């Protein structure tokens, strides 16, 4: 990584990141078999097996109701786009012919590839442990509705084999049929590895995905298809990262203010966030929440981006360039704050706040001067504004400065225009 402090605009640009942009979805359909637990009862009083049976029966009855509400309703920009696409595939699987096709292709094995009538090619996975326990062990050991048995092994196994189902029901009930991420109950780590391998991608994508499973589980999500008898059918959308290895950079900024006897004139760059090259276009993500970092790799969603001209990057070299209208926000009201960057921090200290940088073993290193200061993560461990302490990162990289008088020093605080938000740098002078 390489971070440059831009003194003229109290901003930083950090370069050397590599894109991992989600372009599509790979569908893994699951059939969780619970078994005929509704044809079992415990007429014995309180018991371990009775407790587990009632939990399993109720979880399965609750799932049929979350499914009915979901079906009624279905008949963040990235989250909205993802759900729309998944729900379209879910309506395909919900057809009677597709369910039975999936169940049939899964009668001989626990995993099969299938192409739906919609043309979507999916992986199907059978999860049979709960049904097998209920039919080959529980149904018989409860001979005559007698559940207070002294085996204990049976109760432990029942609890062991049904918790995945219970956790799945909880996630689909708490999220109305659409989980936000992929838990271990929707897809175990072995199942995730099997699906990641089955994807039509490249060996590189497969390694990046298996070395970043937690990121994969956050980018993907799950959708309830429905309850067909004692079989719970749901789908998991796994991300496809079709754009990879392109250059990305992040812009951070803080208010840059000049002052003349209590009157302030302030400048703030309004182009902060992530930028990624994508096939002859630069893609901009204004919400730093839309991208997550793992080393040099930045994971983003192509559906959450905004296209910008490639000349916009020149705002990081000369904000006062005539070749692009660099967007800034101006005003007479200074804001003191800390903007953490990957390899440091911008500190903007104005009016009546106290700013200092500190060390985790020495304490206060120095007081900061008024205005904008750039702190590297090698000069300090913390920055403090009044009572608020900000922890700096420990990421290593090259630090650079592009020296230059702050543009806001040319503004005349005395008689400075009102607050102009999202304007060109020339509109701020007058």
């Amino acid at each position: 990584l390489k971070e440059s402090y831009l003194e003229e605009s109290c901003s930083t640009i950090t370069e050397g990141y590599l894109s991992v942009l989600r372009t599509g979805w790979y569908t893994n359909v699951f059939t969780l078999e619970v078994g005929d637990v509704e044809n079992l009862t415990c007429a014995d009083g309180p018991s371990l097996i009775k407790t587990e049976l009632d939990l399993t029966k109720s979880a399965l009855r609750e799932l049929r109701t979350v499914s009915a509400d979901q079906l009624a309703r279905e008949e963040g920009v990235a989250t909205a786009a993802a759900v729309t696409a998944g729900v379209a595939i879910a309506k395909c699987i919900r057809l009677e012919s597709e369910v039975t096709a999936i169940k049939n292709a899964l009668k001989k094995t626990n995993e099969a590839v299938s192409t739906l009538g919609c043309g979507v090619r999916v992986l199907a996975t059978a999860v049979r442990e709960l049904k097998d326990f209920v039919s080959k062990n529980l149904t018989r050991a409860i001979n005559k509705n007698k559940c207070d048995i002294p085996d204990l092994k049976m109760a432990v196994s029942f609890s062991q084999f049904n918790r995945r189902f219970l956790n799945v029901v909880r996630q689909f009930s708490d999220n109305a049929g659409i989980t936000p991420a992929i838990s271990l109950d929707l897809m175990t780590d072995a199942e995730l590895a099997r699906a990641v391998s089955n994807m039509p991608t490249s060996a590189g994508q497969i390694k990046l995905m298996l070395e970043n499973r937690a990121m994969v589980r956050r980018k993907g999500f799950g959708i309830l298809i429905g309850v067909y008898g004692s079989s719970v059918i749901y789908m998991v959308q796994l991300p496809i990262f079709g754009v990879i290895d392109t250059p990305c950079w992040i812009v951070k900024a803080a208010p840059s203010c000049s002052e003349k006897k209590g009157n302030y004139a302030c400048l703030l760059r309004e182009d902060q966030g992530w930028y990624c090259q994508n096939a002859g276009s630069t893609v901009y993500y204004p919400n730093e929440k839309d991208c997550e970092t793992r080393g040099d790799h930045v994971f983003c969603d192509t559906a959450a981006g905004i296209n910008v001209a490639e000349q916009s990057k020149e705002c990081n070299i000369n904000i006062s360039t005539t070749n692009y209208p660099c967007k800034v926000s101006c005003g007479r009201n200074p804001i003191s704050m800390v903007a953490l960057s990957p390899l440091g921090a911008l500190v903007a200290c104005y009016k009546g706040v106290s700013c200092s940088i500190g060390s985790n073993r020495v304490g206060i290193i120095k007081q900061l001067n008024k205005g904008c200061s750039y702190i590297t993560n090698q000069d300090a461990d913390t920055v403090t504004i009044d009572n608020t302490v900000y922890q700096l990162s420990k990421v290593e990289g090259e630090q650079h400065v592009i020296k230059g008088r702050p543009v806001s020093s040319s503004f005349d605080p005395v008689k400075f225009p009102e607050d102009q938000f999202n304007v060109a740098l020339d509109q701020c002078f007058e």
Epitope: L18, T23, G24, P200, G204, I240, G242, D245, A279
Partner: antibody, heavy 124, light 110 residues
């Protein structure tokens, strides 16, 4: 204008070495995966090697594994193929091609821009 | 394995002809898509179809294509003299990576 121009083709004896160069212009070179495809006289197209936008990933056909090394320099927007231990069956027109991948249902790269190719002739 | 095409296809001007592309489980059968190129003699291949059935901007509507299971096909509906060329299908293989079909020469019997 989007253009790829290959160079470095010529005659070489079995066991010899050549380095091909592709000059890219008219597009953001560092955004794209790049490929080499070759075509023997009167024969079909044959993929040779690929390199990712920032050289993190590279791949080669079984025939090129060990002997050939792909590389790029995004500063000069140039692609290169270092060919060593060349044999007569490597005689071909070598094309430089820009790759794209929609990544919607799979990652299956297609080649939307091709250079005109340079001839590499391996003969004793 | 290798992706095979018929060596030659021919038709009259105004005829519809098809070009098959026979893949396998490690490529088209593995879920990878199929692209097509047209190559006039002496020139570089030109992208003709991408992602099974989409035409780039400079490709007339008489070209269409599709993919099914482990094979694909390209259709030219109403051959014209300029369509005489070599045509290659293209996919990705789980073990061989980028794979090109063996190629088909189309003759327009004029």
């Amino acid at each position: 204008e989007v253009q790829l121009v290959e160079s470095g083709g010529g005659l070489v004896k079995p066991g010899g070495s050549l380095r091909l160069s592709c000059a890219a212009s008219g597009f953001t070179f560092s955004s794209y995966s790049m490929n080499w495809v070759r075509q023997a006289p009167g024969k079909g197209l044959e993929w040779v090697s690929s390199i990712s936008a920032s050289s993190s990933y590279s791949d080669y056909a079984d025939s090129a594994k060990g002997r050939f090394t792909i590389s790029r320099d995004n500063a000069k927007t140039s692609l290169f193929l270092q060919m060593n231990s060349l044999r007569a069956e490597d005689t071909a027109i070598y094309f430089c091609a820009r790759a794209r991948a929609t990544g919607y249902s799979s990652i299956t790269p297609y080649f939307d821009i091709w250079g005109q190719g340079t001839l590499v002739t391996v003969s004793s | 394995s290798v992706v095979t095409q018929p060596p030659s296809v021919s038709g009259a001007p105004g005829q519809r002809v098809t070009i098959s592309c026979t893949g396998s489980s490690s490529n088209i059968g593995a879920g990878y898509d199929v692209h097509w190129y047209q190559q006039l003699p002496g020139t570089a291949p030109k992208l003709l179809i991408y992602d099974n059935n989409n035409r780039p901007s400079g490709v007339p509507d008489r070209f269409s294509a599709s993919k099914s299971g482990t094979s694909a096909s390209l259709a030219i509906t109403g051959l014209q003299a300029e369509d005489e060329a070599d045509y290659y299908c293209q996919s990705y293989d789980r073990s061989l990576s980028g794979v090109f079909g063996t190629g088909t020469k189309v003759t327009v019997l004029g």
